[PDB]
Design a protein around this ligand. Sequence first.
Ligand SMILES: [Ca+2]
Ligand SMILES: [Ca+2]
Ligand SMILES: [Ca+2]
Ligand SMILES: [Cl-]
Ligand code: NA
Ligand code: NA
Ligand code: NA
Length: 208
Amino acid sequence: MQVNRLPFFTNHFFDTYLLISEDTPVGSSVTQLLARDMDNDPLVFGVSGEEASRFFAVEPDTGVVWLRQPLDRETKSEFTVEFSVSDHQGVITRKVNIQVGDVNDNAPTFHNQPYSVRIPENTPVGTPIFIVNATDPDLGAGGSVLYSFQPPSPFFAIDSARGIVTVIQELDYEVTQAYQLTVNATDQDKTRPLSTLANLAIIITDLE
Ligand SMILES: [Ca+2]
Ligand SMILES: [Ca+2]
Ligand SMILES: [Ca+2]
Ligand SMILES: [Cl-]
Ligand code: NA
Ligand code: NA
Ligand code: NA
């Protein structure tokens, strides 16, 4: 007799990877599973696995794969997903690597606040007194932070790439005993930069 011929997948992505942008809206089709059954049997498609089934859903008859929950590359940057196809006599599965594509969706975050430093009034021009650090988990320019004072200061400077704060004019405890500066950390996304502000207190101490 004839033995049933099981279906097999014909998508090219099973051998490489599927890319899905993290800004993909829920409900969006992310691909369509394609399969052949040489008996011309009607086929039913699925996704298997607890995590995969949470994030992705599959139209049983058409094989269209849907986004069921929002993606977030900064929480999980890829998935290994098992898809199935069945002619109702047997079930064939195959795995695909899904890469989550980055969008610039995070502002920088400053660590180890509150920021404060005490320096003596004879601290000379050029002296580094504080290093600010903000991180940005996005990729490329959207993850590359630049620092500035906003508003600017005539007494202190901050290195835009390194976050190193230096004295740029002589200090004088009699004139000013404290400064309140605002550091801006911005990513360098070309279309939609995101930024964050942090306070820096510089306290001047008198020699005696
Ligand atoms: Ca078949
Ligand atoms: Ca991102
Ligand atoms: Ca960013
Ligand atoms: Cl297959
Ligand atoms: Na499932
Ligand atoms: Na994200
Ligand atoms: Na970064």
